[PDB]
Design a protein around this ligand. Structure first.
Ligand code: MN
Length: 393
């Protein structure tokens, strides 16, 4: 019975032909932002599949093959997620045991050209754009984002409301593993990392899936007890503070690091035959902090324009958020051609309750207080998409 690092090291020790089966190599990948949820969900799916197939739950059912968990970023970018590093350290998962974009490319390169590369998707429901030329078929989906209604024949195909995708992944596998306590012990830090960050320690965005996953972890982590003490929840709170603090820590990172470490890119289809290439970076510190840490407004904006150019974007959006004295604050900063950016912002300003504090839409760089403090990137993207659909051409 291998632990999670032992399972990962075992995959690393195998020839690709023993990972693949009948000319199919199967992976599981999260989304291009590679946050805690994407990383935890991918590793969990893959590890649970391994345990399931090796065990007696799968008897008189038949056993597939290994699933390689993928983290969809360059290996070097892992360190930008200090919260994730901390949680991986708790499980003794070494970075050299994990599989990143480089590894997936080496896989695709080192396997025969006739071998199909099929993917489970977790924390997304269509293939990340950067992997479209690597992945042949989507075979299963577990996600909690807007349902794009693709891959309707996926097995499983779970796209449902959840604070954390990881809750859905875990509950799915927990049933199949008949509550296997060892598995739960072996993944709990990674699972709870994702659930607690995504739900702000089970205080925001909580759904029945998250409540169930937590209940299941508590039962195991407690073991045999005559009464339930406060200690488990106290430990959960200390762990939350550690991960939240580290997610909130971007000191010492470059502007490019900050922009790329929680980033999603889209192409919006509009009335024009050419779409809008748009990237959105979600950031944990306010603009004045960012400026002060990065040589000032001018220097900071210069580095943003560089990142925009490098990623081939028509529009770059920065979404900041933070909490102070118990209250949420948000800002939205947009960079792009004055025409498109003015029209987009003018169409979403009411819903997002945007108040200009710097720049000018006509210059193509503008900075807004966002008084709709409930709206995250998950909401902002469709608002912008709708706005873009209304633009003439
Ligand atoms: Mn998620």
């Amino acid at each position: 019975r291998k632990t999670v690092p032992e399972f990962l090291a075992h995959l690393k020790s195998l020839p690709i032909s023993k990972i693949a089966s009948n000319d199919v190599l199967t992976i599981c990948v999260g989304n291009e932002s590679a946050d805690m949820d994407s990383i935890a969900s991918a590793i969990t799916y893959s590890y649970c599949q391994y345990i399931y197939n090796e065990g007696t739950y799968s008897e008189e059912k038949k056993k597939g093959s290994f699933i390689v968990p993928i983290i969809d970023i360059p290996r070097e970018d892992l360190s930008l997620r200090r919260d994730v590093m901390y949680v991986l350290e708790k499980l003794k998962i070494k970075e050299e045991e994990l599989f990143f974009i480089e590894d997936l490319k080496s896989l695709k390169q080192n396997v025969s050209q006739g071998t199909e590369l099929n993917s489970y998707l977790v924390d997304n429901n269509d293939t990340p754009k950067n992997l479209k030329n690597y992945i042949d078929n989507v075979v299963g989906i577990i996600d909690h984002h807007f349902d794009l209604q693709k891959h309707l024949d996926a097995e499983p195909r779970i796209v449902k409301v959840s604070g954390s995708c990881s809750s859905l992944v875990f509950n799915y596998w927990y049933e199949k593993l008949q509550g296997d306590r060892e598995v739960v012990m072996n993944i709990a830090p990674l699972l709870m990392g994702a659930i607690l960050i995504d739900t702000s320690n089970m205080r925001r965005k909580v759904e029945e899936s998250d409540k169930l996953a937590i209940e299941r972890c508590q039962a195991v982590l407690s073991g045999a007890v005559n009464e339930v003490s406060a200690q488990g929840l106290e430990d959960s709170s200390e762990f939350y503070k550690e991960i939240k603090s580290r997610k909130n820590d971007i000191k010492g990172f470059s502007v490019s690091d900050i922009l790329k470490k929680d980033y999603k890119q889209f192409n919006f289809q509009g009335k024009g035959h050419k779409g809008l290439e748009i990237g959105l970076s979600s950031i944990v510190k306010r603009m004045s902090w960012l400026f002060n840490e990065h040589g000032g407004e001018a220097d900071f904006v210069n580095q943003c324009r560089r990142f925009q150019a490098e990623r081939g974007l028509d529009v770059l959006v920065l979404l900041t958020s933070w909490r102070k004295a118990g209250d949420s604050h948000r800002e939205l900063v947009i960079l792009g051609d004055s025409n498109v950016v003015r029209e987009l912002i003018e169409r979403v300003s009411d819903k997002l309750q945007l108040q200009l504090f710097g720049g000018n839409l006509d210059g193509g760089v503008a900075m807004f207080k966002q008084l709709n403090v409930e709206a995250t990137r998950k909401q902002v993207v469709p608002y912008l998409e709708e706005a873009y659909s209304n633009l003439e051409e």
